[PDB]
Chains A and B, each alone.
Chain A
Amino acid sequence: EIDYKDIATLKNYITESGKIVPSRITGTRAKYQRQLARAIKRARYLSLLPYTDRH
């Protein structure tokens, strides 16, 4: 299960600018792509990850 705290893994699924990478490019399953997006959005709110790269 994906953890919003597990920042090291989450960084694999965001671009250099901070955007979530499409599942068609990373080859992620749909059910887990939805968990990644939720986790990434929680991490952004806690300032563990950036919203946009111009931070």
Chain B
Amino acid sequence: RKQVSDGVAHIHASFNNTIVTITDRQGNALGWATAGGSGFRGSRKSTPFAAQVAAERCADAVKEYGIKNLEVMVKGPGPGRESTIRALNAAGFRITNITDVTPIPHXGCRPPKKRRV
């Protein structure tokens, strides 16, 4: 119920889903939406469109906070890397900064075995 105006949007863009979480500048979450909970399952959930719908719903969940400015942190290789950012600017927020925070091990742990499909 306290105003913030300066938040941070975190985009978790995996191959199967997109999670959008808006926090303040200290990491405290204010609201979230996901492509899977916006009415899409299966092959529809892992699309750029479903990611866009999630970005809108997240913008609505935090409209009480009076957020005006956003930094954007994108994480992952999924199809919702760009449509979520496009929708966050179309939602009225002023996109101040865009950053990739995808984790990269500097070697790290052995990955799972290759799939034989």
Interface residues of chain A, those whose CB is within 8 Å of chain B, are: 51-52, 54
Contact = CB atoms under 8 A, between A and B. Distances in A.
Contacts of A54: 99, 101
Interface of B: 99, 101, 104, 106
Residues of B contacting A: mostly: loop
4 contacts: A51-B106, A52-B104, A54-B99, A54-B101
Contacts, number: 4
A51 B106 CA distance: 10
Contacts of A51: 106
A54 B74 CA distance: 13
Nearest to B73: A54
B97 to A, nearest CB: 13
A54 B99 CA distance: 9
Contacts of B101: 54
B3 to A, nearest CB: 29
A15 to B, nearest CB: 13
Contacts of B104: 52
Contacts of B99: 54
A6 to B, nearest CB: 24
A54 B106 CA distance: 14
A53 to B, nearest CB: 9
Nearest to A54: B101
B76 to A, nearest CB: 15
Nearest to A51: B106
A18 B53 CA distance: 35
Nearest to B101: A54
